[PDB]
Write an enzyme that holds these catalytic residues in place. Structure first.
Site, PDB file in Angstrom:
ATOM      1  CG  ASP A  20      -2.026   1.097   1.133  1.00 26.22           C
ATOM      2  OD1 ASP A  20      -2.744   1.127   0.126  1.00 26.22           O
ATOM      3  OD2 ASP A  20      -2.175   1.929   2.053  1.00 26.22           O
ATOM      4  CG  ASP A  26      -3.321   4.081  -2.611  1.00 26.12           C
ATOM      5  OD1 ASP A  26      -2.536   3.190  -2.214  1.00 26.12           O
ATOM      6  OD2 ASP A  26      -4.437   4.253  -2.082  1.00 26.12           O
TER       7      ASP A  26
HETATM    8  C1  AFJ Z   1      -4.101   7.261   7.422  1.00 23.71           C
HETATM    9  C2  AFJ Z   1      -3.706   8.095   6.234  1.00 23.71           C
HETATM   10  C3  AFJ Z   1      -3.474   7.266   4.995  1.00 23.71           C
HETATM   11  C4  AFJ Z   1      -4.771   6.855   4.390  1.00 23.71           C
HETATM   12  N1  AFJ Z   1      -4.634   6.427   3.016  1.00 23.71           N
HETATM   13  C5  AFJ Z   1      -5.677   6.021   2.297  1.00 23.71           C
HETATM   14  O1  AFJ Z   1      -6.817   5.978   2.749  1.00 23.71           O
HETATM   15  C6  AFJ Z   1      -5.406   5.624   0.859  1.00 23.71           C
HETATM   16  C7  AFJ Z   1      -5.664   6.841  -0.011  1.00 23.71           C
HETATM   17  C8  AFJ Z   1      -6.290   4.433   0.425  1.00 23.71           C
HETATM   18  C9  AFJ Z   1      -5.702   3.076   0.845  1.00 23.71           C
HETATM   19  O2  AFJ Z   1      -4.760   2.652  -0.146  1.00 23.71           O
HETATM   20  C10 AFJ Z   1      -6.774   2.012   1.030  1.00 23.71           C
HETATM   21  C11 AFJ Z   1      -6.193   0.629   1.392  1.00 23.71           C
HETATM   22  C12 AFJ Z   1      -7.229  -0.446   1.717  1.00 23.71           C
HETATM   23  C13 AFJ Z   1      -6.587  -1.830   1.745  1.00 23.71           C
HETATM   24  C14 AFJ Z   1      -7.912  -0.154   3.046  1.00 23.71           C
HETATM   25  N2  AFJ Z   1      -7.611   1.904  -0.159  1.00 23.71           N
HETATM   26  C15 AFJ Z   1      -8.869   2.343  -0.188  1.00 23.71           C
HETATM   27  O3  AFJ Z   1      -9.412   2.873   0.778  1.00 23.71           O
HETATM   28  C16 AFJ Z   1      -9.630   2.147  -1.502  1.00 23.71           C
HETATM   29  C17 AFJ Z   1     -10.877   3.128  -1.598  1.00 23.71           C
HETATM   30  C18 AFJ Z   1     -11.659   3.020  -2.903  1.00 23.71           C
HETATM   31  S1  AFJ Z   1     -13.050   4.196  -3.041  1.00 23.71           S
HETATM   32  C19 AFJ Z   1     -13.873   3.555  -4.495  1.00 23.71           C
HETATM   33  N3  AFJ Z   1     -10.038   0.758  -1.609  1.00 23.71           N
HETATM   34  C20 AFJ Z   1     -10.038   0.074  -2.761  1.00 23.71           C
HETATM   35  O4  AFJ Z   1      -9.731   0.581  -3.839  1.00 23.71           O
HETATM   36  C21 AFJ Z   1     -10.483  -1.367  -2.659  1.00 23.71           C
HETATM   37  C22 AFJ Z   1      -9.368  -2.351  -3.002  1.00 23.71           C
HETATM   38  C23 AFJ Z   1      -8.261  -2.417  -1.965  1.00 23.71           C
HETATM   39  C24 AFJ Z   1      -8.631  -3.275  -0.788  1.00 23.71           C
HETATM   40  C25 AFJ Z   1      -7.024  -2.943  -2.602  1.00 23.71           C
END
Ligand code: AFJ
EC number: 3.4.23.46
Length: 370
Positions: free
Chosen positions: A35, A220
């Site tokens: 990630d 990302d």
């Molecule tokens: C605390 C500060 C940093 C926060 N960073 C984030 O929230 C980043 C931008 C997103 C992070 O990469 C998470 C990862 C997921 C595995 C939870 N991804 C998502 O929330 C995204 C949001 C999509 S909105 C249609 N999830 C997905 O795309 C689904 C597939 C994943 C499970 C592979």
């Protein structure tokens, strides 16, 4: 050298890419999502319906409790847990062991994915966005501080079960063709970049370039979609709808809810446009472009597909559908991100994903949002 790390990533489409790691003494093996959009290393450490295994702190003689709680919210999904440290290794990575911070996840909400095959997350971004605060050293910073691994890594994400490579500490030239083109990391928190121009089938979207980066643009590997600010998303969908008006789709298709299908082998790829994102370059008034094919933003799920461009209120996210066509170098040492055409690119019959330059682009600094 790096040949041992080629093909060290696995995944399921739309469910993330993961690498094998071990934590604790004796080693406990876990699959860990890679990630680049976050900065906490965290693993399931309690039973969960979607977990086949988890981290057992009581079985590791090298575990140390930090006696502090932690919570991390993502765009979708969140977890809370207990902070500690332990020894960590990457079997198909460099031959090292580091003592790293680990969040033991004890409660979570829409974080783990049923059938994904991973049990933790490796946040590869910078300490500035780590929780609870920037004093919790991220894994890659610990890795570089404690060993001789150089301060960079690269990701080759391969689309249509999926696979890829995470080259820890360098660049493997067998993984790409053509030249690498570099864009500055604007600020070390997310991997933030600046998009300076957008074209669809060769036509400029003709928006104020600040709109492309409102309120940031990031790379990302943990987001599936290309996610675009509201104004940009609407302009892009309008252009893509017009190019494909030959055929008719449900309106929930364009929102990502409904899938579209065609008889196996008859998908009309030709009516969907290519998308070019121009990124800020390394020299004055210079940019380069990456070109995305519809095979990247129509995610296969007869042949059925979901629209993998969606709307954002927190800036642009260049997710897996963007990264899948390219070899992406996270050159932390030189504060830059490199793009090259991947060796595992998808084949259109008359078109190809590309990384091309140089281009001249005036007033690029004005495209960053403040
Ligand atoms: C605390 C500060 C940093 C926060 N960073 C984030 O929230 C980043 C931008 C997103 C992070 O990469 C998470 C990862 C997921 C595995 C939870 N991804 C998502 O929330 C995204 C949001 C999509 S909105 C249609 N999830 C997905 O795309 C689904 C597939 C994943 C499970 C592979």
């Amino acid at each position: 050298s790096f040949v041992e790390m080629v093909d060290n990533l696995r995944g399921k489409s739309g469910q993330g890419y993961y690498v094998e790691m071990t934590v604790g003494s004796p080693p406990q093996t876990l699959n860990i999502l890679v990630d680049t959009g976050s900065s906490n290393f965290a693993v399931g450490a309690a039973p969960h319906p979607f977990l086949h295994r988890y981290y057992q702190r009581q079985l590791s003689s090298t575990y140390r409790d930090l006696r502090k709680g932690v919570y991390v919210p993502y765009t979708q999904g969140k977890w809370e847990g207990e902070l500690g440290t332990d020894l960590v290794s990457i079997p198909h990575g460099p031959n090292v062991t580091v003592r790293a911070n680990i969040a033991a996840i004890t409660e979570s909400d829409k974080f783990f994915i049923n059938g994904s095959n991973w049990e933790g997350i490796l946040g590869l971004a910078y300490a500035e966005i780590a929780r609870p605060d920037d004093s919790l050293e991220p894994f890659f910073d610990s890795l570089v501080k404690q060993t001789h691994v150089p301060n960079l890594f690269s990701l080759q994400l391969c689309g249509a079960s999926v696979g890829g490579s995470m080259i820890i500490g360098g660049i493997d030239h067998s993984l790409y063709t053509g030249s690498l083109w570099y864009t500055p990391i604007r600020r070390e928190w997310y991997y933030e970049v600046i998009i300076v121009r957008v074209e669809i089938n060769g036509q400029d979207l003709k928006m104020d370039c600040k709109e492309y980066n409102y309120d940031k643009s990031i790379v990302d590997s943990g987001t599936t979609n290309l996610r675009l600010p509201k104004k940009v998303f609407e302009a892009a969908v309008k252009s893509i709808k017009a190019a494909s008006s030959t055929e008719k789709f449900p309106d929930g298709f364009w929102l990502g809810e409904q899938l579209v299908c065609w008889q196996a082998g008859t998908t009309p790829w030709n009516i969907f446009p290519v998308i070019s994102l121009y990124l800020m370059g390394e020299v004055t008034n210079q940019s380069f472009r990456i070109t995305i094919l519809p095979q990247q933003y129509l995610r296969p799920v007869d042949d059925c597909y979901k629209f993998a461009i969606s709307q954002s209120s927190t800036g642009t996210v260049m997710g897996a559908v963007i990264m899948e066509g390219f070899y992406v170098v996270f050159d932390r040492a030189r504060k830059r991100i490199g793009f090259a055409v991947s060796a595992c690119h998808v084949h259109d019959e008359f078109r190809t994903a590309a990384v091309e330059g140089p281009f001249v682009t005036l007033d690029m600094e004005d495209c960053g949002y403040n």
